[PDB]
């Protein structure tokens, strides 16, 4: 009769950077979604594949929660089929994604006067990330023909930057916290279902 640790993810103290998003596997508990789609606190609750009304009355095999923080002008890229820097180098969603993406502003908990450089993100890479691929390498990206072999300079950059979060930025540059709940349907007796 245990309850799913939904509060441990949404009310968490700190979120990981977008480049290395956190991952939480939820199972063996009863899921009560009435709190989610009736909270009036999330600024985005898009669902692809199902609807918030029917989502509660449908059994799920497994569920994964990927939480991160991205700037305001990059929340429109977390969707199946979209492209961009975040959609090819940081977080790539599959084309047959069946799940939901919650998002809410956090301009009062992830900001500080002078700049907050604790949230990193990848900018340069060789190829595009596969669906649900994680990369935490910090090697020097090579853009030219000459091999830099680990020294920075011309044609050799650092593939990790960070946003300058400040409390005086526009809504496009404000740090929004995003949580993607994916439902990987497999062959299982549906251990987790709603009332």
């Amino acid at each position: 009769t245990n309850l799913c640790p939904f509060g441990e993810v949404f009310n968490a103290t700190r979120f990981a950077s977008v480049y290395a998003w956190n991952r939480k596997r939820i199972s063996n508990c009863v899921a009560d979604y009435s709190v989610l789609y009736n909270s009036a606190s999330f600024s985005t609750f898009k669902c692809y594949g199902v609807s918030p009304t029917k989502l509660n009355d449908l059994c799920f095999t497994n569920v994964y929660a990927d939480s991160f923080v991205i700037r305001g002008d990059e929340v429109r890229q977390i969707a199946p089929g979209q492209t961009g820097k975040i959609a090819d180098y940081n977080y790539k969603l599959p084309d047959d994604f069946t799940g939901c993406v919650i998002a809410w502003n956090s301009n009062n908990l992830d900001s500080k006067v002078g700049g907050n450089y604790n949230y990193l993100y990848r900018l340069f890479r060789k190829s595009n990330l596969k669906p649900f691929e994680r990369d935490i390498s910090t090697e020097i990206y090579q853009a030219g023909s000459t091999p830099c072999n680990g020294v920075e300079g011309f044609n050799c950059y650092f593939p990790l930057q960070s946003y300058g979060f400040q409390p005086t930025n526009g809504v496009g540059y404000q740090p929004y916290r995003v949580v993607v709940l994916s439902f990987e349907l497999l062959h299982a007796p549906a251990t987790v279902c709603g009332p």
């Epitope: 002008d73 929340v75 809504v171 496009g172």
Partner: antibody, heavy 128, light 112 residues
Framework: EVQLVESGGGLVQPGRSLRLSCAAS????????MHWVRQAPGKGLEWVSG????????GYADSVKGRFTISRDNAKNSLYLQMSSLRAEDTALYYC?????????????????????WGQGTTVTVSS | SVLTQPPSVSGAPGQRVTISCTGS?????????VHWYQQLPGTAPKLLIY???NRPSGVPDRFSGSKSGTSASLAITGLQAEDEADYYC????????????FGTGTKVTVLG
């Protein structure tokens, strides 16, 4: 079939308050987002405010932020707008539009499909 | 912000005309699309072009649209007697809690 009719229009001396309503039928009003669009007599369009599927995302224009209050009730499939402290510029024609996505937001929206269905219009004249 | 448009464009039947909607680094500089609405005299505005490249049902094949850089352009080839109206461009803005912005408006009239 999709039609929106707005009532609650008339003449009110500046300073008073008004309530502009907007009903809906022929579609799922519970999902789509709603917006208010005003147009001055013989001028261009202008945005007023917008709600999206819940009271979580609510946006207002940079000139009517502290005056207009938008609301909605999914039971009766209707939205409301409570205007107050009117000035000599609020006289216009108002339309209650809807978004083209099922669960699009208003504060950081994915601007696609535009606004398909528009209302007939309701006049709001403010003459002292 | 606001989107700039030419105040008036005209022409003859069977001629190509174009309207330009210029934005900024926030309106069109980001990955925000731009839609085109057409308003007839005395009627409610109608959705003419959505997504800056697609076209809803009902709109004929004459109306086309294309964006580039930070500016979009609508094109009407082969004007008729039914295309004298107002045209507006719309896009989102992300600045100090940005809001939906509209264009100035272009009055297209055929020189009959």
């Amino acid at each position: 079939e999709v039609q929106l009719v707005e009532s609650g229009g008339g003449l009110v001396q500046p300073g008073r308050s008004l309530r502009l309503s907007c009903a809906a039928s022929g579609f799922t009003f519970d999902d789509y987002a709603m917006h208010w669009v005003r147009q001055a007599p013989g001028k261009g369009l202008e945005w007023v405010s917008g709600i999206s599927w819940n009271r979580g995302s609510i946006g207002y224009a940079d000139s009517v932020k502290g005056r207009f209050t938008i609301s909605r009730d999914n039971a009766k499939n209707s939205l409301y707008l409570q205007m107050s402290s009117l000035r000599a510029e609020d006289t216009a024609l108002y339309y209650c539009a809807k978004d083209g996505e099922r669960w699009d937001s208003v504060v950081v929206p994915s601007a696609r499909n535009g606004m398909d269905v528009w209302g007939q219009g309701t006049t709001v004249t403010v003459s002292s | 912000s606001v989107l700039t448009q030419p105040p008036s464009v005209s022409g003859a039947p069977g001629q190509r005309v174009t309207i330009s909607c210029t934005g900024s680094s926030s309106n069109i500089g980001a990955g925000y699309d731009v839609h085109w609405y057409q308003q007839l005299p005395g009627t409610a505005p109608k959705l003419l072009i959505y997504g800056n490249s697609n076209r809803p049902s009902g709109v004929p094949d004459r109306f086309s649209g294309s964006k580039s850089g930070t500016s979009a352009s609508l094109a009407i080839t082969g004007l008729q007697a039914e295309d004298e109206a107002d045209y507006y461009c719309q896009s989102y803005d992300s600045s100090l809690s940005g809001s939906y912005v509209f264009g100035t408006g272009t009055k297209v009239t055929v020189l009959g």
